[PDB]
Amino acid sequence: PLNWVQGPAIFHMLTSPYTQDEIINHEMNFLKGRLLELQEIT
Amino acid sequence: NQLIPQAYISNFHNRLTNEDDGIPIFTMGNAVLPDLQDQHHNPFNILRYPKIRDTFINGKVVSPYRLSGEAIMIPITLDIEHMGHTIKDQFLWNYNDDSISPEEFASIYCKDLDMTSATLQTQIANIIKEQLKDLENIAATEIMSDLHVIINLTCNLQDRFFEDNFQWNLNDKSLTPERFATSIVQDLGLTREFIPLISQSLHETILKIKKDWVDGHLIQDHVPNDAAFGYLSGIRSNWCPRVEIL
Amino acid sequence: AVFDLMTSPFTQEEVLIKEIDFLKNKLLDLQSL
Amino acid sequence: NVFQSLPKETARGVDDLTRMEMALLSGIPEEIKWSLKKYLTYSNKAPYMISLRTLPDLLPLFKTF
List, in order, residues 6 or more apart from D5 with CB less than 8 Å away. Answer: B8, B61
CA distance D23 to B40: 36
CA D60 distance to own-chain centroid: 15
Any CB–CB contact under 8 A between C6 and chain D? yes
D2, D7, D11 member nearest B60 (Cβ):
D2
CA distances from A16 to A11, A27, B214 (A): 12, 13, 77
| Alpha helix segments (H runs only) across A1-42 | 24-39
Residue type, B229: F
The span from the CA of B7 to the CA of A7, in Å, is 25
Rg value, chain B, Cα:
23
What is B44-57 written as a DSSP string? GGGGGSHHHHHHHH
Nearest to B19 by CA among B108, B85, B117: B85
Choose the closest CB to D46 out of A4, A8, A12. A8
- DSSP 8-state class, residue A15: S
What is the nearest CA distance from A10 to chain D, expressed in angstroms? 6
Q: Name, in order, each residue with C-beta under 8 angstroms of B43's C-beta and a sequence gap of 6 or more.
A: B2, B4
Quickly count: other Cβ atoms within 10 Å of residue C11's Cβ: 11
Strand B150-155 with B161-167, pairing? antiparallel
Q: Which of B4, B54, B61, B65 to mutate to test the interface with D (most CBs of D within 10 A)?
A: B61
Q: Cα(B181)–Cα(B198) distance, rounded to whole angstroms? A: 5
| Contact between residue B58 and residue B114 where contact means Cβ atoms under 8 Å apart | no
CA distance D24 to D35: 7
Rg (CA), chain C: 12
CA distances in angstroms from B64 to B106, B137, B211, C10, D20, listed in the order given: 16, 37, 42, 23, 21
Whether D49 and chain C come into contact, CB under 8 Å, resolves to yes
Distance CA D13, CA D10 (A): 6
Experimental method: cryo-EM
Instruction: Give the integer Cα–Cα distance in Å for A28 and C30.
Output: 7
Residue B136 contacts residue B95 (beta carbons within 8 Å): yes
How far separated are the first and last CA of chain B, in Å rounded?
Answer: 53
**B83 phi-psi bin (left φ>0, alpha ψ -120 to 50, beta other):** left
Contacts of D49 in chain C (CB under 8 A): 6, 8
Q: How far is D17 from chain A (nearest CA, A)?
A: 10
DSSP letter for B43, please.
G
Residues B47 and B35 sit within 8 Å (Cβ to Cβ): no
Q: Are B229 and B237 in contact (CB under 8 A)?
A: yes
Contact D49 C6 (CB under 8 A): yes
Q: Do chains B and D touch (3 or more CB pairs under 8 A)?
A: yes
CA-nearest residue to A28 within chain C is C30
**Chain length of chain B:** 246
Return phi, psi of residue B176, to 5°: -70, 135
Instruction: List the single residue in C5, C18, C22 with the smallest CB-CB distance to D15.
Output: C5
Nearest CA-CA partner of B39 in B51, B49, B25? B49
* List of E strands, chain C: 5-7
DSSP state of B24: S
C8 with A3: Cβ contact below 8 A: yes
Q: Which DSSP helix (H) or strand (E) runs through B86? A: strand B85-94
Instruction: Give how far C31 is from chain D: nearest CA, Å.
Output: 18
Q: What is the DSSP string of D24-55?
A: HHSS-HHHHHHHHHHHHHHHHH-TTTS-TTT-
Resolution given for this structure, in angstroms: 7.6
DSSP-derived 3-state class of residue B77: strand
Print burial letters for D16-35: b (CB count within 10 Å at least 16), e (below 16): bbeebbebbeeeeeebbeeb
Of B186, B200, B188, the closest CA to residue B244 belongs to B188
The DSSP symbol for A10 reads B
Phi-psi bin for D4: left (phi > 0), alpha (psi -120 to 50), beta?
A: alpha
For residue D62, the Cα-to-chain-centroid distance in whole angstroms is: 13
CA gap B8, D6 in Å, rounded? 7
Instruction: Say which of C16, C23, C30 has its CB closest to residue A41.
Output: C16
Q: Which of B201, B218, B197, B245 minimizes the C-alpha distance to B23?
A: B197
